[PDB]
Design a protein around this nucleic acid. Structure first.
Ligand SMILES: [Mg+2]
Ligand SMILES: [Mg+2]
Ligand SMILES: [Mg+2]
Ligand SMILES: [Mg+2]
Ligand SMILES: [Mg+2]
Ligand SMILES: [Mg+2]
Ligand SMILES: [Mg+2]
Ligand SMILES: [Mg+2]
Ligand SMILES: [Mg+2]
Ligand SMILES: [Mg+2]
Ligand SMILES: [Mg+2]
Ligand SMILES: [Mg+2]
Ligand SMILES: [Mg+2]
Ligand SMILES: [Mg+2]
Ligand SMILES: [Mg+2]
Ligand SMILES: [Zn+2]
Lengths: 114, 122, 216, 53, 120
RNA sequence: UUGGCACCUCGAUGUCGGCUCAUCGCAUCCUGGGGCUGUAGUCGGUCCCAAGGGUUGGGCUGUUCGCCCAUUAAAGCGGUACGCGAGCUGGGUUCAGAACGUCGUGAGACAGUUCGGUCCCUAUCCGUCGUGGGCGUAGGAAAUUUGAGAGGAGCUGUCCUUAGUACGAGAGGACCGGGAUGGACAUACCUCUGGUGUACCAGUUGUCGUGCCAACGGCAUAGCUGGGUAGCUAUGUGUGGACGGGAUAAGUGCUGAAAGCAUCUAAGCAUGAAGCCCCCCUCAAGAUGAGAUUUCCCAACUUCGGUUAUAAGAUCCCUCAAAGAUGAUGAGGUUAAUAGGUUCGAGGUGGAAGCAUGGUGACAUGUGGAGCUGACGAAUACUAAUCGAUCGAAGACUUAAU
């Protein structure tokens, strides 16, 4: 494991309501925007290109095309700022990090569905 | 991470298409600018007929960067490109339309009209 | 004003009340005991001597520092305690609030306390001026034969010497460093750990001293 | 760079103060009684730690 | 891990050679640092042999050299066959620690600390 | 600075500019404190104190200068062999080639120009940065320490509020005070974002092997390519220059005579700077003035001066890393988890081999988040830290008090 004390003190930060997913899956991440006192949910939909780290430190990245511009959002997997995650589609990929998508656009960048 | 000589797409219909960074404003020896910072730049490429002309020295607010930005909650946003918007002295855009997504940090920057015109604010 | 000794376990992160990501250092601070009490009358200044991390008892043919020698055992048994691995004085505390033999639990600190943390920074061995002193390189091309050298070390006939304080290659790190105005993020009394905001000097397993911050 | 002045006998011998070798780290072999290097097989009898090597 | 004064490819080659030779001869004289590196390699090979399955055998084949061992009965076997036969059977009940190193003292030519590393 | 002189150097004192690294002065560019103002306010002008810190990137030119672009609180002026070539460069300039203009009959020449054109040195001493040993510090030791001294640090923008208030016809627009947030710099550190990651995983080409298939190995930059643990890291993450005290400078005064008045000054009492001494950080008793506290050891023999091996303790040697050039430091040495192995994990990779199934086949699917896995976490004496040896006290004298 990681160091026992680190795990003990960070255990209560971990969320248990997160669906399983892998790089290549398309996710809808409902993110809490808390601008001022009003709070709203903004959905970011894209392909998981990266998951890294462990424990409370684990992060993941989702890539989207917005108005023709690629946008990548990286979240701490256990951040309380995420209302929920929906796995919209399971992709068929051959590697953990899909960095090769950053250089692809259009039909070249499509991920096969499982 | 924008520094002198960095080139940027212009994300508006002001007439300028590509600018070169002349200066990062906001202090002596300041080397790099990121989303929400203002730069002095020169118009290297422009659309025929626009308000902003090639060779103009103008000011622009950075709205997208490949480096991206980190947020207090430990999340990040990164873009495929470096884009800026040419601005007037009152932070309003020289153009009338904004193209492509912009980062929310512009709101804290008080670039409210750019934020409003942007097709998406992330 | 409070003080304690622990071991650097490592870094991790916690989510704050608004979801802000707080990097933290985990300090395990078990087995702190007041070994000696110094006073103006006897020693000329007030301080509590604290011993941290029990070690093993004296044995005849001890070959390492794991086993207390007889001087150390006598010193600790005077306080009634088991011999300790690290012993440090705190002058910043009020001696009248402590008894020799007393336990110093992590609970002495509370979340929100602003603290100074002192440690020995990581060693780097022999290092050059660029790394050790952050100097600029010479050109890497254009005919240069000056890349990582330290540059001119003096002037000429005046002064026909190099001044003390000239920055030169040498051993780097292993220095006492105090980082001021860190914050106690969390105290876990079951595990005897303190979560301090930010990073602190030293390697993992390294001794760290936590005191109430001197500035206020 | 070259020596500006030759080195006196005194200065040379002072410098050589620490230039020397030590007696090897040796003890008597409990088996054969001949000296051996500590933590090494004894070459006289080939024994180590009460056994032949 | 030690570099042993060799490049990555050379070090890999030498450690395979040493491991094979120790499997063959069951005890070899070499320098101290080489022995302290090769002990791990050889004992991991022992672990593979004790596992005994085909995948283990092929993993071992990746490391061992192709050497023929002439047995006392005029019969021959490869080093890999010896490893997965007699050595593994020998160490079936031992959990690690299949080698020991015996310091011998510096050698004449260069003062290197000669040692013996042997199985068991 | 341009010069005058010709006193050191012609058995050689390298010459411009730049780079690297600074260091000092103050005649101060900014910031701090003041007086006067033809100082309404906001701005300014001039002078006084003040050297703590700060004092930018580009275009042209060998350039220094200088002009220009864009910034900044500001873009200071000087010295240090016009600081620094046994630290770097070598664009200019004064070797040999060649050419133009010019002069000269010519050979050639020109503080005219043009293109090209060899920058050596293993550090002896002092000096400086680190790092060990000896002896001293009136017994021998283990820790914790005081701080005489010394070093570090010392910079600043903008916005909000006070307040659209004071001031001003208006335009404009404050002091003082209270908050927030930056630039540059410094320092620690790897949770995060990234880099590297040559004994991690995977894909793939050519060719040569392991007899063949299948599966593997060598070489081709680590063959190449996609990822990547620890460690080391910045561009990443934290933190700092905060708040104050004492004495002052220029000043501002109070009381006050000499000199019935006046007067900040003679006596006396206040106040007053980013500056001084502290406060903050680090080193520090070889501080030979060698300091302090706690604890440990404490006998025999003696030519009775003294000696002795031993004690406490520390080492040799050995397993090591958080430490490291080597020493040193630190974790350990069987009454043991120090390392290796082994077992279980984390993180990484991403679906092993074999077999089965579906395809003519390339391949695909299942078995199966599979197989593998350096450095990171835990457990376990299986291997090795064996057996041993060495060093290391018995406490001088005088006086006073007890
Ligand atoms: Mg440079
Ligand atoms: Mg070179
Ligand atoms: Mg190779
Ligand atoms: Mg001469
Ligand atoms: Mg002055
Ligand atoms: Mg000169
Ligand atoms: Mg000069
Ligand atoms: Mg010189
Ligand atoms: Mg030249
Ligand atoms: Mg003529
Ligand atoms: Mg990191
Ligand atoms: Mg990590
Ligand atoms: Mg061949
Ligand atoms: Mg084949
Ligand atoms: Mg070949
Ligand atoms: Zn023997």
């Amino acid at each position: 494991t990681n160091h026992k004390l680190i795990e003990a003190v960070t255990k209560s930060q971990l969320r248990t309501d997160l669906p399983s997913f892998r790089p290549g899956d398309t996710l809808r991440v409902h993110v809490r925007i808390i601008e001022g006192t009003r709070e709203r949910i903004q959905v970011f939909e894209g392909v998981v290109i990266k998951r890294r780290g462990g424990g409370v430190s684990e992060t993941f990245t989702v890539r989207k095309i917005s108005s023709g511009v690629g946008v990548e959002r990286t979240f701490p997997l256990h951040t309380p700022k995420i209302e929920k995650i929906e796995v919209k589609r399971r992709g068929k990929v051959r590697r953990a990090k899909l960095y090769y998508l950053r250089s692809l656009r259009g039909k070249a960048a499509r991920i096969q569905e499982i | 991470m924008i520094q002198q000589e960095t080139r940027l797409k212009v994300a508006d219909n002001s007439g300028a298409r590509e600018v070169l960074t002349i200066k990062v404003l906001g202090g002596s020896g300041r080397k790099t600018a990121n989303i929400g910072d203002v730069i002095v730049c020169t118009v290297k490429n422009a659309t025929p007929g626009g308000v902003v002309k090639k060779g103009d020295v103008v000011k622009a607010v950075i709205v997208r960067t490949k480096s991206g930005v980190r947020r207090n909650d430990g999340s990040y946003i990164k873009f495929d490109e470096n884009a800026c918007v040419i601005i007037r002295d009152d932070k309003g855009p020289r153009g009338t339309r904004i193209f492509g997504p912009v980062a929310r940090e512009l709101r804290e920057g008080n670039f409210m009209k750019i934020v409003s015109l942007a097709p998406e604010v992330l | 004003t409070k003080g304690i000794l622990g071991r650097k376990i490592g870094m991790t992160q916690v989510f704050g009340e608004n979801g802000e990501l707080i990097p933290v250092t985990v300090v395990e601070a078990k087995e702190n005991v007041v070994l000696q009490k110094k006073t103006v009358e006897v020693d000329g200044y007030n301080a509590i001597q604290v011993g941290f991390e029990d070690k093993k008892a004296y044995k005849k043919d001890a070959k390492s520092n794991k086993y207390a020698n007889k001087p150390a055992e006598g010193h600790a048994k005077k306080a009634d305690a088991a011999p300790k691995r690290f012993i440090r004085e705190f002058r910043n505390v009020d001696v009248d609030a402590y008894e020799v033999g007393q336990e110093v639990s992590v609970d002495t600190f509370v979340a929100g306390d602003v603290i100074d943390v002192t440690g020995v920074s990581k060693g780097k061995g022999f290092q050059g001026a660029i790394k050790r002193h952050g100097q600029s390189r010479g050109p890497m091309s254009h005919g240069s034969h000056f890349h990582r050298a330290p540059g001119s070390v003096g002037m000429a006939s005046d002064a026909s010497r190099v001044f003390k304080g000239q920055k030169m290659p040498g051993r780097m790190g292993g220095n006492t460093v105090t980082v001021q105005n860190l914050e106690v993020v969390q105290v876990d009394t079951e595990n005897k750990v303190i979560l301090v905001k930010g990073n602190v000097p030293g390697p993992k397993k390294g001794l760290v001293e936590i005191r109430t911050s001197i500035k206020k | 760079a070259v020596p500006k002045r030759r080195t006196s006998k005194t200065r040379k011998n002072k410098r050589r103060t620490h230039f020397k070798i030590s007696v090897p780290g040796m003890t008597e072999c409990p088996n054969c009684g001949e000296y051996k290097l500590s933590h090494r097989v004894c070459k006289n009898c080939g024994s180590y730690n009460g056994e032949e090597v | 891990y030690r570099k042993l004064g060799r490049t990555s490819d050379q070090r890999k080659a030498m450690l395979r050679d040493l491991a094979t030779s120790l499997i063959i001869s069951e005890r070899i004289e070499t320098t101290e640092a080489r022995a302290k590196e090769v002990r791990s390699v050889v004992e991991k090979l022992i672990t593979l042999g004790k596992k005994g399955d085909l995948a283990s055998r092929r993993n071992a084949a990746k490391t061992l050299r192709n050497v023929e061992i002439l047995n006392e009965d005029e019969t021959t076997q490869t080093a890999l066959q010896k490893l997965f036969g007699e050595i593994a059977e020998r160490y079936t009940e031992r959990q690690g620690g299949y080698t020991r190193i015996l310091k011998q003292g510096p050698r004449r030519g260069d003062g290197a600390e000669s040692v013996i590393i042997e199985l068991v």
